[PDB]
Structure formats: C-alpha cells, structure tokens
Design an enzyme around this catalytic site. Structure first.
Site, PDB file in Angstrom:
ATOM      1  N   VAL A 260       7.768  32.512  -3.905  1.00  0.00           N
ATOM      2  CA  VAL A 260       8.571  32.354  -5.108  1.00  0.00           C
ATOM      3  C   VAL A 260       7.626  32.570  -6.276  1.00  0.00           C
ATOM      4  O   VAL A 260       6.726  31.764  -6.520  1.00  0.00           O
ATOM      5  CB  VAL A 260       9.191  30.944  -5.157  1.00  0.00           C
ATOM      6  CG1 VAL A 260      10.080  30.806  -6.369  1.00  0.00           C
ATOM      7  CG2 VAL A 260       9.994  30.691  -3.883  1.00  0.00           C
ATOM      8  N   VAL A 261       7.839  33.654  -7.008  1.00  0.00           N
ATOM      9  CA  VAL A 261       6.946  33.996  -8.099  1.00  0.00           C
ATOM     10  C   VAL A 261       7.593  34.097  -9.454  1.00  0.00           C
ATOM     11  O   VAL A 261       8.815  34.138  -9.574  1.00  0.00           O
ATOM     12  CB  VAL A 261       6.258  35.353  -7.833  1.00  0.00           C
ATOM     13  CG1 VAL A 261       5.574  35.337  -6.478  1.00  0.00           C
ATOM     14  CG2 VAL A 261       7.288  36.472  -7.888  1.00  0.00           C
TER      15      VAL A 261
ATOM     16  N   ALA B  98      14.414  31.878  -1.266  1.00  0.00           N
ATOM     17  CA  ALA B  98      13.871  30.533  -1.045  1.00  0.00           C
ATOM     18  C   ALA B  98      14.930  29.463  -1.245  1.00  0.00           C
ATOM     19  O   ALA B  98      14.974  28.475  -0.523  1.00  0.00           O
ATOM     20  CB  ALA B  98      12.695  30.278  -1.978  1.00  0.00           C
ATOM     21  N   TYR B  99      15.791  29.673  -2.226  1.00  0.00           N
ATOM     22  CA  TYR B  99      16.852  28.726  -2.525  1.00  0.00           C
ATOM     23  C   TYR B  99      17.738  28.452  -1.308  1.00  0.00           C
ATOM     24  O   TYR B  99      18.383  27.409  -1.238  1.00  0.00           O
ATOM     25  CB  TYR B  99      17.702  29.266  -3.670  1.00  0.00           C
ATOM     26  CG  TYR B  99      18.515  28.222  -4.390  1.00  0.00           C
ATOM     27  CD1 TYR B  99      17.892  27.238  -5.161  1.00  0.00           C
ATOM     28  CD2 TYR B  99      19.910  28.239  -4.335  1.00  0.00           C
ATOM     29  CE1 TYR B  99      18.637  26.299  -5.865  1.00  0.00           C
ATOM     30  CE2 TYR B  99      20.664  27.304  -5.035  1.00  0.00           C
ATOM     31  CZ  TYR B  99      20.021  26.336  -5.799  1.00  0.00           C
ATOM     32  OH  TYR B  99      20.762  25.407  -6.492  1.00  0.00           O
ATOM     33  N   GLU B 100      17.766  29.381  -0.356  1.00  0.00           N
ATOM     34  CA  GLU B 100      18.578  29.215   0.852  1.00  0.00           C
ATOM     35  C   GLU B 100      17.839  28.552   2.007  1.00  0.00           C
ATOM     36  O   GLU B 100      18.354  28.506   3.121  1.00  0.00           O
ATOM     37  CB  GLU B 100      19.126  30.566   1.344  1.00  0.00           C
ATOM     38  CG  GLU B 100      20.276  31.151   0.529  1.00  0.00           C
ATOM     39  CD  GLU B 100      19.873  31.544  -0.878  1.00  0.00           C
ATOM     40  OE1 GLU B 100      19.152  32.554  -1.042  1.00  0.00           O
ATOM     41  OE2 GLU B 100      20.281  30.840  -1.823  1.00  0.00           O
TER      42      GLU B 100
ATOM     43  N   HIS C  58      -2.630  42.576  -6.645  1.00  0.00           N
ATOM     44  CA  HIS C  58      -1.921  41.331  -6.373  1.00  0.00           C
ATOM     45  C   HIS C  58      -1.216  41.385  -5.024  1.00  0.00           C
ATOM     46  O   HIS C  58      -1.440  40.534  -4.165  1.00  0.00           O
ATOM     47  CB  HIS C  58      -0.918  41.034  -7.496  1.00  0.00           C
ATOM     48  CG  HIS C  58      -1.525  40.330  -8.671  1.00  0.00           C
ATOM     49  ND1 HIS C  58      -0.843  40.122  -9.849  1.00  0.00           N
ATOM     50  CD2 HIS C  58      -2.748  39.772  -8.843  1.00  0.00           C
ATOM     51  CE1 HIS C  58      -1.619  39.469 -10.696  1.00  0.00           C
ATOM     52  NE2 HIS C  58      -2.779  39.244 -10.111  1.00  0.00           N
TER      53      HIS C  58
ATOM     54  N   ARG D 124      12.806  32.460 -15.393  1.00  0.00           N
ATOM     55  CA  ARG D 124      11.919  31.365 -15.022  1.00  0.00           C
ATOM     56  C   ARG D 124      12.152  30.995 -13.563  1.00  0.00           C
ATOM     57  O   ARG D 124      13.301  30.966 -13.093  1.00  0.00           O
ATOM     58  CB  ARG D 124      12.146  30.181 -15.953  1.00  0.00           C
ATOM     59  CG  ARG D 124      11.888  30.567 -17.398  1.00  0.00           C
ATOM     60  CD  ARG D 124      11.809  29.371 -18.304  1.00  0.00           C
ATOM     61  NE  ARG D 124      10.831  28.412 -17.806  1.00  0.00           N
ATOM     62  CZ  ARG D 124      10.392  27.366 -18.498  1.00  0.00           C
ATOM     63  NH1 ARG D 124      10.843  27.150 -19.734  1.00  0.00           N
ATOM     64  NH2 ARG D 124       9.525  26.524 -17.941  1.00  0.00           N
TER      65      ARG D 124
ATOM     66  N   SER E  67       6.082  22.979   4.359  1.00  0.00           N
ATOM     67  CA  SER E  67       6.212  23.965   3.308  1.00  0.00           C
ATOM     68  C   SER E  67       5.193  25.095   3.369  1.00  0.00           C
ATOM     69  O   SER E  67       3.988  24.875   3.502  1.00  0.00           O
ATOM     70  CB  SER E  67       6.120  23.301   1.935  1.00  0.00           C
ATOM     71  OG  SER E  67       5.950  24.282   0.917  1.00  0.00           O
TER      72      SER E  67
ATOM     73  N   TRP F 264      12.717  37.770   0.332  1.00  0.00           N
ATOM     74  CA  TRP F 264      12.140  38.321  -0.891  1.00  0.00           C
ATOM     75  C   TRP F 264      10.663  38.433  -0.538  1.00  0.00           C
ATOM     76  O   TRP F 264      10.087  37.493   0.013  1.00  0.00           O
ATOM     77  CB  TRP F 264      12.288  37.368  -2.070  1.00  0.00           C
ATOM     78  CG  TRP F 264      13.562  37.509  -2.832  1.00  0.00           C
ATOM     79  CD1 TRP F 264      14.818  37.188  -2.404  1.00  0.00           C
ATOM     80  CD2 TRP F 264      13.699  37.964  -4.180  1.00  0.00           C
ATOM     81  NE1 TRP F 264      15.729  37.412  -3.410  1.00  0.00           N
ATOM     82  CE2 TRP F 264      15.068  37.888  -4.510  1.00  0.00           C
ATOM     83  CE3 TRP F 264      12.791  38.426  -5.145  1.00  0.00           C
ATOM     84  CZ2 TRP F 264      15.559  38.254  -5.764  1.00  0.00           C
ATOM     85  CZ3 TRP F 264      13.276  38.792  -6.395  1.00  0.00           C
ATOM     86  CH2 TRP F 264      14.653  38.702  -6.692  1.00  0.00           C
TER      87      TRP F 264
END
Ligand SMILES: O=c1[nH]c(NC[C@H](O)[C@H](O)[C@H](O)CO)c([N+](=O)[O-])c(=O)[nH]1
Ligand SMILES: O=c1[nH]c(NC[C@H](O)[C@H](O)[C@H](O)CO)c([N+](=O)[O-])c(=O)[nH]1
Ligand SMILES: O=c1[nH]c(NC[C@H](O)[C@H](O)[C@H](O)CO)c([N+](=O)[O-])c(=O)[nH]1
Ligand SMILES: O=c1[nH]c(NC[C@H](O)[C@H](O)[C@H](O)CO)c([N+](=O)[O-])c(=O)[nH]1
Ligand SMILES: O=c1[nH]c(NC[C@H](O)[C@H](O)[C@H](O)CO)c([N+](=O)[O-])c(=O)[nH]1
Ligand SMILES: O=c1[nH]c(NC[C@H](O)[C@H](O)[C@H](O)CO)c([N+](=O)[O-])c(=O)[nH]1
Ligand SMILES: O=c1[nH]c(NC[C@H](O)[C@H](O)[C@H](O)CO)c([N+](=O)[O-])c(=O)[nH]1
Ligand SMILES: O=c1[nH]c(NC[C@H](O)[C@H](O)[C@H](O)CO)c([N+](=O)[O-])c(=O)[nH]1
Ligand SMILES: O=c1[nH]c(NC[C@H](O)[C@H](O)[C@H](O)CO)c([N+](=O)[O-])c(=O)[nH]1
Ligand SMILES: O=c1[nH]c(NC[C@H](O)[C@H](O)[C@H](O)CO)c([N+](=O)[O-])c(=O)[nH]1
Lengths: 146, 147, 148, 148, 146, 147, 147, 150, 146, 146
Positions: free
Chosen positions: B71-72, B46-48, B117, B78, B103, B12
């Site tokens: 991770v935004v 990110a979860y992976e 941004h 949320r 991290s 992502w």
C-alpha cells in the site's frame, strides 16, 4: 496469594527489549516473598503482542500483562500503523478482559541502530523496565482500594 | 502436526507482492518441518484483506493467516486511511476470531514507480516474505507454550 | 441467479463522483453484466455512507456494496477526521455484516476546485470507477472459492 | 406524523456553534414545514456529544441526531485526539443504535480568537447549519427508499 | 440524595496533575454544595486510566468519572499513541458502561520541563480543573433532562 | 523594432519542459507579433540556469531572459535545496545585471513517473509557458513606463 | 516638498491586491494629505516586484516603496520558493539602495479561490492596506529623526 | 584560439561516506573519458566534509586552471543532529561561488530522504551513486558545450 | 568611554516587545551604568528592522545594535518568510557594517491572542531582555580581547 | 611557521559546547603538536559567531576558524532562523575572507534539558570535537595541494 504477571516481548531488537524485561523481572521477583511470579513469553514482533496478551489474560492465571517491544522507523517502511495498532490493541484487550495490561512498547523519534543510538536505548530500556514494574505493583494495589 | 496457513495477497503491485508470498512459502518449507500446507487467495486490494482473512479464519481450517500487500502513496490520493484501516482491521480480526493474523502489508516512505524503486522493493519483499514465514512459525509455536 | 450490488454515493462534488458511478455500472455490465444488477442510492455526504451501507447490507438483498465519495480539504475545515471515520466505518460495517464493502471513497493530496483540478478528477474517477467494478467482481468470485 | 430530530450542541465557542443551530432550525422548518420538529440539548464540550447522542437516540424519540461543536486548536494543548474520538464516537453510536447521526462538529485549520477569525466563523457556521438541514432531511428520505 | 464523582489521576507529572485535581474538588464542592462527593484514585500512568474508570464505573457508585493526566513528548519517545488510546479508551469506556467520563487528559504542543513550561502548566491545570468541574455538574444535569 | 528574449531550459523532463517552451514561443508570437524574437538555449538541469542566464543577460543582447525547468521530488533525494538555490539564484542575477529574469522553474507537490502525473504536467506546462510569455511582455512594457 | 511613495503591485489576484492598494492610498491621503504622493506601478506577478522596486528606488524620486501581492498555494506547484525569494529580494533591494521597502506581499495559510475565501481576503487586504499606509509614514519619520 | 586545447575539470569530493561518494567519482571519470576523451582532464581533490566544498571549489575556480568544478558529497540525516542547514549552505554556497567566479560548479552533493547506515541502504546508494556520477559527467560536458554557443 | 547601544523595536505587539526593551535597559544599567547608554528607536514592524539597524550602525555613534520584535503566526498569513528575512537581514547588516547586531526578534511556536498566551510572553520577554543585556555587554567585551 | 587556529565558542550550554572545544584542542595537539596553536574566544550566543569569525579571519593571524555552539528548540521559540543564519553566515564569511571556517554549530532533533539528554550530548560532543580537529588539519593540508 501469589499473583502471576505475564511479560509478552517482541523479538525484534531483542537486545534492547531484553534490557527492559530483565530490569522488570528483577523489580518484580526481587520483592521476593512468592508475592509475584513473572512468566516470560516470546513473540516475533509487536504486532503479535495484543492477541498473545488476550489469550494469556483469558486463562485467568494472571493478574497483569506486560507488553514490551521497540517499534522503530528503519528508514524504508513506515512504522506508525503497526505502533498505533499495538497500543490501541493492548487497550482494547485489557478493557475486554478486565485484566490490566501495561505498555513497554516504545517508539523513538529517531533510531538508526548507530553505535551511539544502540547504546542509548539499550540502557534506557532498563530504566523503562524498572518504571513498568513499579507501575505494575501500583495498579494492582490501586485496584484493591476499589 | 499438520497446520494450514492461508495467505491473503492483494493484486495491486502483484509483481512485488508475489515476491513476498513465494519467499514466504519457501522459508515456510525450510523452517517448517513439512508441518505446514499453504493456500493462497487472491484479493483485489489491501482493503479487501480483513474481511477475507476473517471469512477464512472462521472456517476453522487454518492455524493463522498472512495478509500481504503493498500500500503506497501513489502521489494522487492519500493512502493512510486505507493503510490504517487494513492494519487496524487485521488486528481487529485476530482478536475477534482468536486466529493469528500476520501483517505483510507494507507502506514505504517513498515509492514513485521508477525502475529503482520498483526493483528495490521487488527485491526487498523477498526479505520481508521470509521474515513473515519465521513470524508465522514462531507465534504458532509460542501459542503452544501457553497452557 | 442474479447478484445485486448496492452503490452508496455521496452528493458532494456529485459531478466527479457520478463519473465513478457510471464507470462502475458500465464496467460492471461489460465484464459481468448478465450475472449482476446494480442499484444506486443517494446520501448527502461521505459521513452518511457507513450507516447506509450497513442498512442496505442487512436487508440480505445484496452481495456487496460500493462506497464512493470525494472527501477533500476545502481550505477551511479539516477533512482528515471524517475521511478517517468513513474508511474505518466501512471496514466496521463489512466486518460485522459479512457483506463486502468496496471503497471508492477518495481523498486527494490537493484539490482546490479549479478548472484544471476539477478537470483532472472528473476524468480520473471514471478510471477508479472501472477499477471498482473489477474489484467487486473479483472479491465476489474470490469468496466463491473459499470452502466456507 | 411529525419526525423529531435531536440537536446536541456544545457550549464551547457557544456564540459560533449557535449560528449553526439557529440556521439548522430555520432551514429545517424552511424545507419540512410541520414534517419535523427540533429539540436542542446542551452539552459542556464536544467530548460529551457521543454519549448524549447515543442516549437520546436510544429513547426511540428521534429520527436523527445532529452533533455540532467548534473544536479548534487553542495553541496550548493538542486538539486532535478529542476531535478524532468524537467523530469516531458519533459513527460508533449511529452504527450501534441504527439512528442517523450527522456531524456539524467542525475543526478549522486555524482559529486564533482574532476578531476577524471569530467574525468569519460566526458567519460560516450559518452556511454549515443550512447544509446540515438538507443533509438531515435527505438522509432520512433516503432510508425510506430502502425496502428494509 | 448525593451523587458521587470518581477521579482517576495519573502520577506522571503528578505535581501538575494535582493542581487540576484540587481545583476540581474545590470547584465541585463550590458550585454543587452538599450535592456531590468526590473520590480520588491514583494510577501510575495515563495509560491505566481507561481500565480504572471502567472498573470504578462498574460499581454503580458514581454518576461520572474524571480522568486526568499530563501526556507529553519528553523528547525521547513518541507520545501520541498512548495519548490517542487514552482519549479513545475513555470514550469507549463511557459508551459501553453509560457512565459519563469527562476528560482532563491534556497533551500540550510543547513541554520541556523548563522553568517556564513547568510553571505555566502547574498554573493552567487549575483553570482546567475548574472547567472539568463545571463540565461534570453540567452534563449530569443535561442528562436529567432526558 | 524587435526585442530578443532568451530561453534557458533544463533537459531534465525535457518532454514536459518543452511544452512550456513551445507554448511560450506561441504566446510570445500571438500577442507580440514580430516585435519579439526568441532564442532558446540548452542546459543540463535547473542548477545550471542562473549562471547561463546571467552570462546571457550580460551580452546585453536580450530584453529579458526566461528560465524553465521541472524540479521535482523523485522520491530518493531531497529536491528543495536545488529548487531553492535556483529560484534565489535567478533573483540574484536579475537584481545585479538589471535584466528581468522570468521564472518557469516549477516544483509540483507530487510527481511520480506514473502516466497520470506525466500526462497531467505535460499538459499543464503549456499553460505555465503561456503565463510566462504574458509576464515577459508585461514586465518589459512596464519597465518602459519607469521614466 | 512632496514625498512620493511608489507602490508596486502584482496582477495575479489583482482583485484582492487592488483592495490593499486602494486602502493604502486612502489612508495615505488621510494622515498625510499634500505631504505625500502615491504612484502605482503594474507588474505581472510577485517575482517581478524586487527588480521593479530596485529600478524605481534607484531613480531617487521616491521616499519609499510598497511592494504588494497575493502569493497562494494553488494546490499544484509549491509557492514557498517564490514567496521566499520575493520577501528576501525586497530586503536585498532596500539594504543595497537604502530606500525603505515595505511589504504587503502576503501568503495565506489557505486559499482556494472559493466564494468564502475570496471574500475574506478581499476585505482583509483593506486592513493590510491601511496598515502599510501607517507603517510607511512612521518609518519615514523615524528615519527623519536619525543623524 | 581554436580548440586543440584541453579543458580541466576539478572534482571536490567529500570524505564522509567516502565509500559511496567514490562510486560517483569513478563513474564520473569513466563517463568523462568515454565521451570527452583527451579533450578533458580530471583532477580529484579530497575534502573533510560537504561544508568544506564551497570554499575549496572557489580557490580552485579562481586559479583559472579549470573550466568547471564538480562538488560531490553525501549529506545524510544521522538521527541525532539536523543535516538541513549544512546541506542548504553547501548547495547555496556553490551557487554563490559559480556566480562570483563565473566558473561553472556542478552539484553532486546529495541528501537522501532516508539513510540509516544499513546493508540495503548502503548497497542501494553505493550502486545508485555510479548512476549519478555518469549524469554529472554528461552535465559537465554539455554545460561547457552549451556555453560555447552563446 | 561611554559606549552607546541602539535599540530598534517594532511597534507590533508593542506591549509585549516593550517588556524586553525596558528589561534590557535596566539590566544594562544594573551591569553597565556609566559605561553604556541606550537609545531607543521605534519602527512599524520587524521587517523594517534590518534597514534601520544599518542606518544607525553607519552613523558610527553606536557600538552595537539590538533588534527586537515579536513575530508570530497570526493564523491568517505565513510568518516564516518575514522572520527568516529579518534574522538573515540583521546578520547581513552586521557582517557588512561591522557593528554587532544582536537579536531579540522572537517567534513563538504557538501564539494565539488569548489572555493566557499574551500573559506568558508579556512576562517571558523581560527574561529575553536581560539575556540580551548580558549578550550585548559580553560581545563588546570579547571583541576588545581581539 | 606555526599555524594558529581560532575557535569561536558560544556560551549557551557552555558545559556541552566546551566538551567539543577541549576534545578539539586535545586532538589538535595529538595529531600534529607544535605545528598548530589554538586560540579560544568566547561569544554569548551562536548568532554572534559569524561576525566574530569574520573579524578574527580578517587579521590574517589564523589559518582557519572553528565555530561551535549548541542550538536547540527550547519549546517556546523557533530555533530554525538562528541556526540557519549562523550556518549560512559562516559560509558567507569563509567565501569573502577566503579563510576556512569549519562548523561545530550543532542542532539536535530533540533536547529537553534532562538527566539523559544533557548526558548524551555532553559526551557526544567529545566525538564532534575530534571530528572537527581532523577536518581542520586535513582541509589546511588539502589547500597546500593547490
Ligand atoms: O517489534 C517490532 N516488530 C516489527 N515488525 C512488525 C510486526 O510486529 C510483526 O512482526 C509482523 O509484521 C506480522 O506479524 C517492527 N517493524 O516492522 O518496524 C518494529 O519496529 N518492532
Ligand atoms: O493493495 C493495495 N490496494 C490499493 N487499492 C485500495 C483498496 O485496496 C481496494 O482495492 C478498493 O479501494 C475498493 O475496495 C492501493 N492504492 O489504491 O493505492 C495500494 O497501494 N495497495
Ligand atoms: O467543544 C469543544 N470542547 C473542548 N473541550 C473538550 C471536551 O469537549 C470537554 O469539554 C472536557 O474535556 C471534559 O470532558 C475544547 N478545547 O478544549 O479546546 C474545544 O475547542 N471545543
Ligand atoms: O462527501 C463529502 N462530504 C463532506 N461533508 C462531510 C459529511 O459527509 C456530511 O455531509 C455532514 O458532515 C453531516 O453529516 C465534505 N466536506 O465537508 O468537505 C467533502 O469533501 N466530501
Ligand atoms: O501520564 C503519563 N504517562 C506516561 N506513561 C505511559 C503509560 O501511562 C504507563 O505509565 C506505562 O506505559 C505502562 O502501562 C507518559 N509518557 O510516557 O510520556 C506521559 O506523558 N504521561
Ligand atoms: O532540472 C532539474 N534538475 C535536476 N538535477 C539537478 C541539477 O539541475 C543539475 O542537473 C546537476 O545537479 C549538477 O549541476 C533534478 N533532479 O535531480 O531531480 C530535477 O528534478 N530537475
Ligand atoms: O503574484 C503571484 N504570482 C505567481 N506567479 C509567480 C511569479 O510571480 C511570476 O509571475 C512568473 O513566475 C515569471 O516571472 C503565483 N503563483 O505562481 O502561484 C502567485 O500565487 N501569486
Ligand atoms: O559530507 C558530509 N559531511 C558532514 N559533516 C559536516 C561538514 O561537512 C564538515 O565536515 C565539519 O562540519 C566542519 O566544517 C555530514 N554530517 O554531519 O552528517 C554528512 O552527512 N556528509
Ligand atoms: O513585528 C512584527 N511585524 C508584523 N508585520 C510585518 C512587517 O514587520 C511590517 O510591519 C509591514 O509588513 C510592511 O513592511 C507581524 N505580522 O504581520 O504578523 C508580526 O508578528 N510582528
Ligand atoms: O547558541 C545558542 N544561542 C541561543 N540564543 C540565540 C543567540 O545565540 C544570542 O544569544 C542572542 O539572540 C542575541 O543575539 C539559543 N536559543 O535561544 O535557544 C541556543 O540554543 N543556542
């Protein structure tokens, strides 16, 4: 007997963290008599404190571990996730190893590394450093009473 | 002595993420003394990262792992939960395997996918990517200081 | 050699959740199809997912599980504690089983179960469902690359 | 054979937490006849639920455990750390024992002890109780489908 | 036979924490008669309570442990991380050891150590001590019925 | 007879703002039919609406005035003050000039320049315009009843 | 010499609002009867209340004015600016006109128009309506006792 | 009379963070010249802080020599005191002025979400402020144009 | 030479509010006596304070007006809008009429109708009553020095 | 020919507020002595500042007015309503009277009346006093340029 205490400090904001480590290392060493011994270990950031305290704690050569860092909000990224993970981490480690681990990992409400802001926490950290050392002495002592 | 570092990068915002991964490898090269080899692994989000970082750590082939993701708060769902689970998960992984996990999973105060941004962070991740490299070389060596 | 995927879907806001599920199977078939098979199991709500994911995981019959639900704030009770437990739960489950658990457990900043709102997420979940399919194939193909 | 379910209710706001328990038992019998039985156990506060549940679950006597409590914000101390360690606890217990543990430990956005506030939740916990019965019945039916 | 209860009380805001401790002992000995006996242990801060409770719990001399402290926002640092990890720590310690760990680790919305606050909690902590006592006697009884 | 309604629209997010306007005009016609006439005026952004509206109301040529703009948090600067200064501003102008000023100055909880957000609000705004049109007709009819 | 009170009610959520209005009239006739008269006026939304309260007030035919409405966060746009501008605007109106303006313009912490919420405020607004009734009579008497 | 006239625009710039604010000022004058050229003239007035902008904008506005006034300042959160009250009073104050005087007052008074006087922060806004200045200009020219239509 | 002060008190939570009023009257005498005289006026609720304070100020019989009320968060509706309007309202009123309008319209961070909360404020309001007494006297004195 | 500046200082946290006043005076004399004269007036609380400044402003005797106060959250009541009505008030006052009114009415993020907090702001207010002085001189000069 000579009790070994390990200090694991982050290097972010070294300037301010060191004011806590020195104050701490004084209260610990100054009550000199070979009673305690303070070994200081460098760690890049707070996130690197838990695993280092564990590895150190698992050598069995330490009666306590101090984790110290200054974890702030720099205005760009959020700092709570890391702060949370480190505090919960040290708790998990000590419960795991049975070796006490004191927290000198601070997170202020505000810190813009402004002249005033820097001055303040640079001096307050020596205060916290003294606090931590006296709490360290006390917890070890409170354990003999069990 | 040769040391392998595995990088687990999400896809992502690959764009921005990769700026960190490359800045990471370059810095790693400079301050490394040619001691490090770096393998990069692609992961959807990110979860992976935790499960992947763990599987890699268990091979015993690597000295440390660097999870990196952006991770935004997309403004629809949320992101705290996922963000927290990932940072908590990596801490969790290094404690159980004894393998350092750094991290580079960043969550900003504000990212609205605007040119400003996107550009800003596309640029800043190079700064973080370098920070991650130094952190990696520092902790590994710090650990060599523990008898 | 067929690889199975388990989909643990909660039954709250089933309307919206199922759009993620059928967008998952369709995408899954479309990008892989032949090589994968998808079994779907029903669970009362999101809180019941972690355990179910773990059980399906421990049968050894699956290459990965997809957790999917719609955990919102209905204006009466707080939802953050549950949503939080489901996300850490799935991370907890996948870490001890070694079986990948993809998350499609979503919580919206705002959802008042209004036509426009309902309409919005009903549509968007198919989008997330398609994202889950690619994620699933990719992590499985990614693991295939680790010289375990 | 008959399946046993353990309800671990908290004694804080007992008056309200009981409309849930009372409704849970009604619906349970309403949609399961003699298929299930309900054993209610009392606990001081929500924080005592996790251990009790893990203990009840470990006797192998129960098919599932329902945790129920009303953890409000009294306006003096902070309630989150408790609410949070309890929902996390019940998730920790179920994953470790393997027994379903449903949550009826609700935290409202607002509760000030006003007559109105009490009346509302005295009534609404009945709705939740009924929901907890369906959840409990269904989750258990769902695990059976898993060729473990 | 007599059941022993262990109390782990933090020394921060000790003056207040002790109203709860003394109200606990008073209420305990009151509703339990000669049935129970209470042992008090001093810990520097709220962060040292979990590990102390686990260690005490692992001596198999206590049927329960009571952790009690006042964790507040002093207007300089964030307090929620420590609070969070103490409440989780005790929950974790009790689940692993099996020994109940009742919580008297309170965190108020607001505490500025003014005259009003200090008095309000110095007093209310007595109420909490009584509550923790009844909770203690009640849970141990609830467990006997399993 | 016919009644003049003036529309003051901001040009920020003109895309989205215009769906409200065209919708306002449509509804105005469907339920008002030749009884109402709509004059549209351009303004740079929401902040300019109060004065423009007041100046218009003072021409005594309009039975009412509509103010419409999309005031959002773009993720870099705080939008509250302006959104607030303009909602109070329109109140200010209508209370003093005596001319009704209807509000279609909306601020979403979230808007991130992502297709999803843009499309959602581009679509939803025609709904807000419809409401303002009805409010407009209704308020005027009511004022009529005040003897 | 009958005293007329003018009630200005919004029409959004009229369902719930009308409960306050009906309770207000009931109580108003209970503790008054033949001393007061109630005139009700319909308005689109809350934003139109301040100007209507003013116009009505300035006719000098009312001893007081009751503006009542339901202003909820619908989950899409922010409702604080409008609430704020309505509660403040009424204050502006009574201060400049000298005619008391009572508020029954409520904004709930949470409202999702679900079965349960609707019923909660549908009933509660009855309580509010009777409170506004008492407040209305009392204030006029309190002012009656001032030189 | 017919328009062979020049319209004066007064800019009331604050001095806190003069560095960043100035970038918005020059970009404003440049844009202004670029599109206005000869049909407008810009006078810049210095002021201590954002709080001083309203009263200054009002004194200028009441002389009648300007067709519009642009207030520009950078109200940030320094991490010690709250900046909300001032920011809100300055934003409301200008609106107060323009409605009372009737003279348009454009707002370039910005309050960012996060500013921690750092290299990237400073650089981000030093650059972005020129973007805001150009916007201020087009807004100023357009609003004046738009009014002429009434 | 007897300056009259008018007190506008809301009847909402009349119980807790009247503890400020009576405290105000006693302190006013305790430090004024003969010099000032207090007149109390009952108003339904906070929101009615501004207009009353105005009407009183305009009669020209009062040198200062005290507005007092307890405006809390009821857990059902938002209270800020009304609080904000009243604080601004009284400010608005004093600047126009020119009569000082002091504020005893207080909003607590947390107030749930329980014995603990109700007692706290029932007691703390006399403190605010005396504070308001000295404020009133001082402001009237200071204005003369102009 | 001499220009007179009026200072309306609140007496809450007088100790700290006065640091700003004296620092102000000393800077006002240092950067233009003789040209400016400073008259100091006392007010009870910040909420009293607007009206006082208005009355002082309307006498034509002063070239400007400085409002200074320390408005903090004491952990019991909300302070946002007064802070806001006071900052909006001074703006309302300077726009109607035309007399400049500078602001030194500060509200910190965190202040808990303690050794460190009181110390920090006590000294910091000196910095805010000097800052207000320069702003005073500069704005009055800026106005001459019209
Ligand atoms: O010690 C700190 N490290 C920080 N770095 C994060 C982490 O400690 C690691 O260095 C790195 O992220 C991955 O190993 C901080 N912030 O990012 O803000 C901080 O405030 N303090
Ligand atoms: O790496 C990221 N993954 C994201 N996806 C979530 C997760 O990483 C997985 O891809 C998927 O949810 C199921 O496992 C993100 N958001 O959704 O916003 C994000 O910002 N960053
Ligand atoms: O079940 C509840 N228990 C509560 N007590 C907390 C805990 O459950 C135990 O009773 C006790 O703290 C000692 O373990 C509550 N509050 O304190 O507010 C509450 O609202 N609800
Ligand atoms: O999947 C969901 N489950 C929900 N219930 C929580 C949980 O999943 C179980 O159904 C039940 O709590 C007992 O286990 C929800 N809410 O309560 O709002 C929700 O929004 N979504
Ligand atoms: O018991 C408390 N300990 C506190 N100290 C933290 C911790 O308990 C240890 O004393 C020390 O941090 C090192 O372990 C507190 N605060 O810091 O605010 C507090 O409020 N209460
Ligand atoms: O109408 C809007 N105007 C905006 N500009 C502010 C103002 O309306 C004027 O254009 C300009 O500030 C000076 O008059 C916006 N943002 O800046 O984000 C916005 O979202 N919406
Ligand atoms: O009465 C209400 N009117 C609302 N409309 C706003 C306003 O009252 C007018 O009807 C219209 O905006 C233009 O005058 C609401 N919301 O938008 O959410 C609401 O909740 N309640
Ligand atoms: O223009 C600014 N002025 C500031 N000062 C406030 C005000 O503008 C006046 O200079 C002074 O307060 C007296 O009126 C600021 N801060 O304090 O942070 C700021 O960020 N920007
Ligand atoms: O004085 C108060 N009045 C209240 N009523 C509001 C208002 O003051 C008037 O009595 C009535 O609303 C009509 O104007 C309150 N609440 O509603 O919560 C409160 O806390 N305090
Ligand atoms: O100047 C201040 N006045 C305060 N009192 C309010 C007001 O200034 C008056 O003294 C009194 O309210 C009557 O007007 C404060 N607090 O209450 O916290 C404060 O912090 N600062």
């Amino acid at each position: 007997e000579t009790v070994r205490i390990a200090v694991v400090r982050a290097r972010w904001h070294a300037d301010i963290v060191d004011q806590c480590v020195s104050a701490f290392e004084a209260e610990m060493a100054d009550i000199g008599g070979d009673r305690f011994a303070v070994d200081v270990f460098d760690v890049p950031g707070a996130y690197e404190i838990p695993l280092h305290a564990r590895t150190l704690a698992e050598t069995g050569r330490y009666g306590a571990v101090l984790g110290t860092a200054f974890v702030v909000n720099g205005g760009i990224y959020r700092h709570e996730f890391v702060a949370s993970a480190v505090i919960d981490g040290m708790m998990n480690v000590q419960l795991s190893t049975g070796v006490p681990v004191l927290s000198a990992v601070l997170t202020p409400h505000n810190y813009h590394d402004s002249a005033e802001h820097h001055r303040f926490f640079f001096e307050h950290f020596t205060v916290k450093g003294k606090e931590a050392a006296r709490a360290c002495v006390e917890i070890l002592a409170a354990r003999e009473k069990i």
